[PDB]
Design a protein around this ligand. Structure first.
Ligand SMILES: O=C(NS(=O)(=O)c1ccc(Br)s1)c1ccc(Cl)cc1Cl
Ligand SMILES: [Zn+2]
Lengths: 772, 79, 62, 192, 208
């Protein structure tokens, strides 16, 4: 049996959402930041952003909206988690005491219904008549906001439009009205429906359905006096309001997709727009006062403000200060000013907030491949001290070569098809600014970077072939050859085909500041993963795992193959044992048979799992991380050949993060570090039967004392969950929960340890805090 | 003894649905709704083979040009 | 060209230049309202809704 | 308690007729007897719904044209919905009947539809819709059942909401014909 | 069209990996039936039906012969590896069928322990083909155990009741012949709704 302990070394750093409003007090202008499970509450003060409280929710924050129903002195908060836990929260301060009140809560999951492509959408009516949720295709959930009733009886309305892109509640409406963009075989369209609480149905919307741009992706509900809606596409921006229809096709927006917006002015005269390249625009709604008192929209205009971090979200604060919430790079505070600088930009960075995510690969001190595109960096983490090395391109894989005192980093840069010749770089980056460079004998240009272990200076950049993608990387010694090499696994990616049918294994040696090609081996697919395996090279090509021998003639010679795979994306080895991770087909264990010079399929996990990362804990325990944000531990079944050929899932735990990399690096045994998409860094370790038993009893006791915001059960949160099944967590201890025992008051500690002393457990929890 | 062509069908109309709609007219020997091998879904066409020719004739007379879902069905003959 | 005159909630807020504590809810639980979902199927709800309105249209004449 | 419902329960260890067996051929042991503790036993249940009773009950109490009714001939039952969380079966009842028309006499053949919700916990049905009496003039028996099923198909398509990958009813059948056998979730095909 | 490597890159930076994204790309593996089928079952003439909901098994049937005898098979699938027979059951026990049935094998939404075989003939017989009557044959078969089963281990192909039972039934239908509605008939996880023309029967089988 397997017993494990999971703890957080570094909390998620990517920002998934940010809202402004008056939550703490009617006077305070607040900033609320959502970092997966984390909710940060701030007061916009004279000094700029005063932290008040950070609350960890027992769920992944999917909806975060402030709303003020009539009769409230301050805004209430609506939160919906990824596991569909819905709550309405109220902030209460009594002198020095701070408490978050759960006004209403419940689970709004439907057993039927398939999760939507553009995901969970949570919208609140401007007049606070109801909450609207788009969770599944074909259904629209309505939570009536009524304060004079025991329960908020939520119902579903059928939506004929099964593919909705975005939806919002309109302003200035006598009847609650939803405005949405949907897709059908005839293209994209914009439609409106009135929502009837009385009849539990939709009624004909105020205005006519209109056809829109094929890539129309977002709806902005414009407040009064304008009213109506703004729809943002790839090439155009349109305004709709009954009879009114304005359309602008500014060439400035064509290059990159707009992915976020924020209302600057309360009347919606100005909006901030953020795109995929990090560009910041100002959308201007020019008004015209009518003689009858009403105000109509005369024209739309877009102006490029400058560049910020690639924004996931934007929030205007006060006095030209804007918060840039980034997912792929560092978050910022930026200042907007009327007079342009040396480059002509109106955007000036005021502060930078370190974001480790996405951690695509890492090394063990921890060294990660962080961020993406212009935000791409390396992050060096130690006891936490963080050093950031900008690359201005996407780092993909990392390896350390001790003998060369450097790191091998695979990277990709974006180049554009110009008038003359081939392609040209749009921005200088690590691969184009190396000390020396070589070449192999919009588009992605792949490179192997040799970066100095001390200064992190780009010593050499080796550019791979036209259309060649570098997928895997290893630094090792092979056979009886004394040399240490940088080995790269590639794939030929053409703009005609879908799957790679060609690739290479390239053996490089770094000497005298240059990279020399020692050997090349052609393969008939993508080299997804490579591991050094007992002085041999273990590589996975498409659906085949292959073992190569390195000859005295400096050539790779195929020894054996295993073909029973769908997509062998992940490889890990311990001794003669191989743990293969499949993107679609769960995990499997192989054994190399020295005597037979071939592989033997030992056992497979017959469970359906879409894998993201795999690790070998020990000879008998295998750790898996999948697409549904869960961890699971496989074990060899401890009489018949078929019984031994079946891996058993003995550990289940809902992590709440997407793990891209696992690496190894008395109470607990073993130390496996993991890097996630949200920049969270965690640690997994093994426990004895008796250590697990004591810590499990401690969790059940802690859960009776520690209260949850939104009243989400800890057990529900950590329950293994997929679209297929929901099961209670097993053989896993939440280190975060047990560590929180040291933070509760002494009178509460005694009630937790009631029939063991508080000091017995204090000594236990304190030695557990020393594992990270 | 008689085969018909059924076309202009909605992509979600199943073989079982076609059997239910056509069976009241007469005994059916074989029904084969044509499917796409790549992205497994109905091609919108098929063949229904009645045991009786006069039973197949009445099925055509009563179903050809009439809307099943919102697409007007096309029932015809072969060879 | 058109950027000037940005929203001012308070002049003080960013004038002074720059460069949270974890909430562990203690044993206290005051809550009075729950969120529930409609048990009945939407097709059945609609048919029930139409048939019940038809019964009311029969009671008005009789 | 109602006359339209019939429930039967039978236990087994190593109205429709059942030939419950093991994987070899032994007909097991048909009983209701005592086998203390959950020591592996089979449980078969059978809840029946007499259509002819339902039809007569809904014509009698819930049809405005109920007084005009004489007798019914054939009937076709099509399931419109199954709600597993509320254990409710929505059935549509297609009906060929005989009735007198409006006071505008002579008895005529008509066609109508009866929607009825059947509770599986209680066994009790509840009527949700009673169709109008539409005359069958010169259209055959096959013509009327084809038009009826087309209307059911029409309605279920109209109310069709996509389900999650893993609540799907797998249905497999090969003629002797299939070209490929696909494993959807793992993008694997067996080519025949 | 989107390249698989381009789709994979998006996953690593977004943390969004789902099948409803790889929807429009070709199959990752194609295997021909002839290369994975055991040659000893050539002179048997199996009719392959497809995969079980979990890609572990691939099912097939046999229509052996005056009467017809039906058999349902469970084959262990492992990509390129040959298929291994796990279960072979005799469908419609002590039932004599005088005509080739159009059979369908179904699986419940969340119940992986059982399967349902619905077979029916084009028209019934009373040797001579009888109109206005049709025979429906339905069998509920327990699937093989997923792992080590403690009750199965107790033997003297001995399999416990939970992982080794079979249920059979047969009913005659009249005109208009009831519609086959497999998605609705098996929407409730342990029930089969059977339209016998005269009544609808809710049929639940469960092992405790
Ligand atoms: O229900 C049918 N077939 S089914 O597989 O149970 C299924 C349910 C829902 C969908 Br969508 S498909 C079906 C069959 C025949 C006739 Cl006449 C009408 C229908 Cl509605
Ligand atoms: Zn068993």
């Amino acid at each position: 049996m397997s017993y494990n302990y999971v703890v957080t070394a570094q909390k998620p750093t990517a920002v998934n959402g940010c809202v402004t409003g008056h939550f703490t007090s009617a006077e305070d202008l607040n900033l609320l930041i959502a970092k997966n499970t984390r909710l940060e509450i701030y007061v916009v003060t004279a000094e700029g952003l005063r932290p008040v409280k950070e609350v960890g929710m027992y769920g992944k924050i999917a909806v975060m909206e402030l709303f003020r129903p009539k009769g409230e002195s301050k805004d209430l908060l609506f939160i919906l988690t990824a596991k569909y836990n819905a709550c309405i929260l109220e902030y209460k301060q009594s002198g020095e005491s701070i408490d978050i009140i759960t006004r209403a809560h419940g689970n709004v999951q439907d057993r039927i219904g398939r999760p939507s492509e553009t995901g969970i959408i949570g919208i609140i009516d401007p007049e606070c008549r109801m909450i609207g949720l788009r969770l599944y295709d074909g259904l629209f959930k309505v939570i009536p906001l009524d304060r004079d009733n025991k329960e908020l009886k939520a119902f579903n309305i059928r939506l004929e439009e099964l593919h909705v892109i975005d939806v919002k509640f309109l302003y200035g409406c006598q009847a609650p009205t939803i405005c949405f963009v949907y897709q059908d075989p005839q293209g994209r369209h914009v439609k409106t429906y009135e929502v009837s609480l009385r009849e539990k149905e939709f009624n004909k919307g105020p205005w006519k359905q209109e056809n829109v741009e094929a890539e129309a992706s977002m709806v902005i509900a414009v407040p009064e006096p304008f009213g109506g809606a703004i729809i943002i596409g790839q090439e155009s921006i349109t305004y709709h309001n009954g009879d009114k229809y304005l359309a602008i096709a500014p060439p400035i927006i064509k290059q990159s997709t707009i992915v976020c917006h924020n209302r600057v002015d309360p009347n919606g005269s100005r909006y901030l727009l953020g795109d995929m390249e990090g560009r910041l625009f100002m959308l201007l709604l020019e008004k015209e006062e009518q003689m009858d008192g009403t105000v109509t929209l005369k024209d739309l205009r877009v102006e490029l403000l400058g560049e910020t971090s690639i924004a996931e979200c934007l929030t205007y604060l006060d006095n030209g200060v804007v918060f840039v919430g980034s997912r792929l790079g560092d978050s910022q505070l930026v200042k907007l000013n009327v007079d342009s600088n040396e480059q002509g930009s109106y955007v000036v960075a005021m502060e930078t907030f370190t974001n480790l995510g996405p951690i695509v690969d890492m090394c063990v001190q921890l060294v990660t491949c962080s961020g993406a595109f212009k935000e791409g960096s390396l992050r060096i983490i130690r006891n936490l001290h963080i050093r950031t090395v900008p690359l201005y391109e996407s780092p993909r894989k990392i390896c350390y070569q001790e003998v060369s005192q450097c790191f091998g980093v695979l990277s990709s840069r974006i180049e554009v098809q110009d008038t003359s010749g081939g392609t040209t770089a749009l921005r200088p980056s690590a691969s184009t600014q190396a000390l020396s460079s070589s070449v192999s004998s919009e588009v992605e240009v792949h490179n192997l970077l040799i970066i100095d272990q001390h200064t992190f200076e780009v010593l050499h950049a080796h550019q791979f072939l036209q259309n060649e993608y570098a997928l895997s990387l290893v630094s090792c010694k092979l056979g009886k050859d004394p040399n240490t090499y940088f080995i790269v696994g590639t794939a030929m990616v053409y703009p005609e085909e879908a799957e790679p049918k060609q690739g290479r294994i390239v053996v490089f040696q770094y000497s005298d500041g240059k990279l020399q090609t020692v050997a090349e081996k052609e393969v008939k697919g993508a080299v997804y993963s490579m591991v050094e395996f007992n002085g041999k090279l273990l590589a996975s090509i498409n659906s085949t795992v292959r073992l190569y021998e390195w000859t005295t003639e400096k050539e790779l010679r195929t020894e054996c193959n295993h073909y029973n795979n769908i997509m062998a994306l992940y490889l890990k080895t311990k001794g003669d044992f191989i743990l293969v991770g499949d993107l679609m087909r769960s995990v499997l264990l192989l054994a190399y048979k020295p005597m037979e010079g071939n592989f033997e399929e030992i056992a497979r996990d017959f469970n359906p799992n879409w894998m993201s990362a795999v690790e070998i804990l020990d000879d008998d325990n295998f750790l898996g991380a999948e697409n549904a944000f869960n961890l699971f531990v496989c074990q060899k079944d401890s009489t018949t050949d078929e019984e031994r050929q079946h891996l058993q899932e003995v550990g289940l735990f809902h992590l709440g993060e997407f793990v891209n990399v696992f690496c190894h690096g008395t109470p607990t045994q073993g130390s496996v570090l993991f890097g996630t998409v949200n920049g969270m860094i965690g640690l997994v370790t093994s426990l004895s039967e008796s250590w697990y038993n004591l810590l499990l009893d401690m969790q059940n006791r802690l859960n009776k004392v520690i209260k949850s915001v939104g009243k989400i059960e800890h057990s529900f949160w950590r329950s293994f969950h997929t679209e297929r099944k929901t099961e209670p967590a097993t053989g896993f201890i939440d280190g975060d929960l047990i560590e929180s025992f040291l933070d509760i008051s002494r009178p509460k500690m005694q009630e937790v340890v009631a029939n063991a002393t508080a000091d017995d457990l204090i000594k236990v929890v304190e030695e557990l805090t020393r594992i990270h | 003894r008689m085969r018909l062509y059924v076309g202009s069908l909605h992509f979600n109309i199943t073989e079982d649905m076609l059997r239910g709609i056509f069976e009241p007219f007469g005994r059916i020997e074989s029904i084969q709704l044509m499917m796409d091998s790549e992205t497994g879904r109905s091609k919108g066409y098929g063949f229904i083979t009645f045991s009786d020719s006069e039973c197949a004739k009445k099925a055509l007379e009563q179903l050809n040009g009439f809307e099943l879902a919102g697409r007007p069905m096309k029932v015809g003959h072969v060879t | 060209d058109f950027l000037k005159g940005l929203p001012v909630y308070n002049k003080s807020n960013f004038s002074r230049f720059h460069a949270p504590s974890v909430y562990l809810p203690t044993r206290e639980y005051p809550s009075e309202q729950i969120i529930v979902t409609e048990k009945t199927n939407i097709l059945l709800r609609y048919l029930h809704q139409q048939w019940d309105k038809k019964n009311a249209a029969k009671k008005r004449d009789q | 308690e109602p006359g339209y419902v019939n429930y039967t329960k039978l236990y087994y260890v190593l109205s429709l007729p059942f030939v419950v067996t093991d994987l070899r051929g032994r007909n097991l042991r048909p009983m209701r007897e005592r086998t203390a503790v959950q020591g592996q036993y089979l449980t078969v249940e059978q809840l029946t719904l007499d259509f002819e009773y339902v039809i007569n009950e809904v014509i009698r109490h819930d049809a405005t044209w109920g007084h005009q009714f004489c007798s019914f001939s054939d009937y076709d039952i099509v399931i419109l919905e199954v709600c597993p969380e509320t254990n409710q079966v929505l059935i549509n009842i297609g009906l060929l009947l005989l009735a007198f028309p409006s006071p505008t006499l002579r008895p005529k053949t008509y066609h109508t539809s009866l929607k009825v919700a059947w509770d599986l916990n209680t066994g009790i049905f509840e009527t949700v819709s009673v169709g109008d009496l539409t005359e069958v003039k010169g259209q055959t028996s096959g013509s009327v059942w084809s038009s009826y099923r087309k209307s059911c198909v029409d309605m279920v398509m109209k109310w069709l909401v996509p389900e999650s990958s893993g609540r799907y009813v797998n249905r497999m059948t090969n003629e002797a014909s299939l070209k490929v056998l696909a494993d959807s979730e793992r993008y694997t095909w067996i080519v025949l | 069209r989107e390249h698989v490597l381009k789709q994979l890159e998006r996953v690593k930076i977004s943390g969004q990996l789902s099948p409803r994204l790889f929807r429009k790309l070709p199959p990752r593996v194609c295997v021909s039936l002839k290369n994975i089928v055991d040659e000893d079952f050539l002179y048997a003439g199996h009719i392959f039906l497809g995969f079980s909901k979990c890609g572990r098994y691939v099912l097939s049937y046999t229509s052996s012969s005056s009467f017809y005898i039906y058999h349902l098979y469970w084959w262990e699938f492992n990509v390129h590896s040959k298929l291994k027979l796990v279960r072979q059951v005799r469908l419609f026990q002590d039932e004599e069928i005088y005509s080739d049935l159009y059979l369908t094998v179904c699986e419940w939404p969340s119940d992986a322990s059982k399967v349902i075989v619905f077979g029916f003939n084009t028209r019934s017989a009373n040797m001579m083909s009888d109109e206005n009557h049709r025979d429906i044959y339905v069998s509920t078969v327990a699937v093989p155990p997923p792992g080590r089963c403690a009750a199965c281990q107790d033997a003297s192909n001995a399999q416990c009741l939970r992982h080794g039972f079979m249920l059979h039934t047969k009913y005659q239908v009249v005109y208009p012949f009831p519609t086959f509605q497999p998605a609705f008939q098996l929407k409730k996880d342990q029930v089969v709704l059977l339209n016998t023309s005269y009544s609808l029967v809710a049929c639940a089988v469960s092992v405790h």
